[PDB]
């Protein structure tokens, strides 16, 4: 009983849960952390580590609620270090100092009724993620490269946009983007333009080809 929660010396997101029972040595405290910030930077180089302990058996969506949507568009969520959180305080990273440790938590018969295991939130920056053919068309055609991975937006230095541009450039062969795709001098581009110019050899883009 007499359960209390209070902020500590460190950041306000880190708190102490003071529990006082009838037994004198049960009148102790547990250091935990809960996240209340929205990240727009990186905690460590190349990653974001929110203090939200995603317990097993709940939506991973709740893990990403502490990141700006415009900043997490190029972040992927991966498995994190194991942690434990109060069942009635979801996403509460319970640190392990002194007697507190996951084996001790598992050993106690009553703690298994109030503590749920899981993993800590973890994000890695990779690149923008495409999800359908329309985004690939926008990225490769260079009509809207607002959110395009470097593999699909590098001015046709790689074979990623070859398949889409094969048809996009039959639609319009004089396009500066199609001509720049042909300047890469790969076999799909030259064969596509050989097919285009076998019918329209009297057009300017065939001179450039």
């Amino acid at each position: 009983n007499r359960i209390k929660i209070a902020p500590g010396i460190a950041d306000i997101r880190d708190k102490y849960m003071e529990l006082g029972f009838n037994y004198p040595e049960y009148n102790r405290a547990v250091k935990f952390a809960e996240e209340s910030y929205t990240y727009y930077y990186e905690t460590s180089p190349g990653e974001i580590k929110p203090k939200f302990c995603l317990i097993d058996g709940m939506s991973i969506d709740h893990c990403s609620s502490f990141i700006v949507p415009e900043f997490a568009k190029q972040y992927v969520l991966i498995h994190g270090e194991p942690c434990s959180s109060f069942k009635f305080r979801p996403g509460s990273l319970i640190y392990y100092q002194n007697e507190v440790t996951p084996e001790y938590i598992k050993d106690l018969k009553h703690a298994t009724d109030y503590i749920a295991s899981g993993q800590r939130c973890h994000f890695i920056k990779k690149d923008y993620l495409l999800g359908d053919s329309d985004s690939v068309a926008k990225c490769c055609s260079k009509t809207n490269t607002k959110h395009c991975p470097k593999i699909f937006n590098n001015n046709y230095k790689t074979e990623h946009c070859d398949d889409f541009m094969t048809g996009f450039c039959r639609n319009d062969p004089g396009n500066p983007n199609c001509l720049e795709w042909l300047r890469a001098k790969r076999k799909p581009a030259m064969s596509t333009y050989s097919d285009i110019c076998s019918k329209h050899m009297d057009a300017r883009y065939c001179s450039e080809f």
Partner: protein, 94 residues
Amino acid sequence: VSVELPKRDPPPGVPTDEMLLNVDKMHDVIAPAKLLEYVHIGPLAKDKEDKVKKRYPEFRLVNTGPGGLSALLRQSYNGTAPNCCRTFNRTHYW
């Protein structure tokens, strides 16, 4: 028992781009994937996992994150000579 339990609901979830990915619509992103390259396909159930394994026999499913978050890793090119040596335009076929 003891006192009233101090419950606090977690903040509402805000899904990102990675989690809002459907592997069914990603056939134009996975086909041009190079060897030793990860293509994240979002969450994946087991039935859809077997379906995707059948659909892309050249790839592997790597469980990058919880909640079924999976990625496709290219392993080999299985195309044969009669199907893509008699042309220069074609890169992949279904």
